[PDB]
């Protein structure tokens with residue numbers, strides 16, 4: 681990978697439309713786009729990171745990983761231009777889309793989100809890339825409705841490679857938080873936690889545990905209980921992703937196979953979500 685392949689977009693062809701989250705803007709180049717901005721008030725490390733992020737995303741070619749449209753790095757502030765994901769982050773989506781008595785989502789919808797991200801993770805694994813921060817917050821949706829596609833969006837944590845209290849320990853396997861060891865099997869564990877996040881409809885993992893308690897709990901063999909109404913076949917995938925020894929955890933080909941089996945079982949997909 682070289683900056684050579686990074687398409688530089690003349691800054692004069694780029695217009696910011698609105699803020700989206702604290703930052704990312706909606707933009708136009710008339711091609712609509714997410715614009716990730718590098719602060720002008722940024723460290724020297726921050727700059728090389730920003731460039732790293734663009735190279736990293738630009739080398740992937742997969743439906744379930746956000747596309748990089750280009751960069752505008754010869755002007756300040758520096759921009760990466762990314763696929764615009766109208767549905768927003770998966771965590772907010774699950775929270776906002778929770779069925780309420782005055783009311784959307786079904787089990788098959790959740791399974792399709794899970795499948796989409798697993799497919800993205802399988803691509804990363806077969807290309808020897810370790811994401812290191814698979815979590816609902818880092819996944820994006822093309823749109824809110826039935827045609828939605830989930831994609832992996834945030835390639836910042838992989839690019840970092842901070843402090844103790846900034847580690848996403850609720851998403852990390854023991855060898856990651858104890859030893860700083862990261863493999864393909866790290867992302868498998870994280871995927872298990874993301875699954876829980878999906879089937880809980882956007883709850884925080886280990887509800888009412890702090891980071892240090894989770895660390896002690898997980899190290900001791902403790903695992904989350906199933907999310908409310910979670911089908912058994914789905915919970916079983918989660919508990920396999922959370923095997924204590926990485927070699928006992930499934931790869932993403934196996935995970936994808938198991939998710940696909942779930943989508944074929946009427947007893948799974950006819951399960952109602954809690955209201």
Ligand SMILES: CN(C)/C=C\C(=O)c1ccc2[nH]c3ncc(-c4ccc(N5CCN(C)CC5)cc4)cc3c2c1
Pocket residue numbers: 700701704714716746762763764765766767768769772773817818819820833834835
């Ligand atoms: C979140 N994240 C993962 C951050 C860094 C990234 O790496 C990244 C990369 C490419 C992206 N493309 C996008 N296209 C739309 C959005 C977006 C759209 C709408 C919202 N909303 C609606 C309702 N919501 C509750 C409040 C605002 C939020 C985000 C984000 C990205 C994006 C992020």
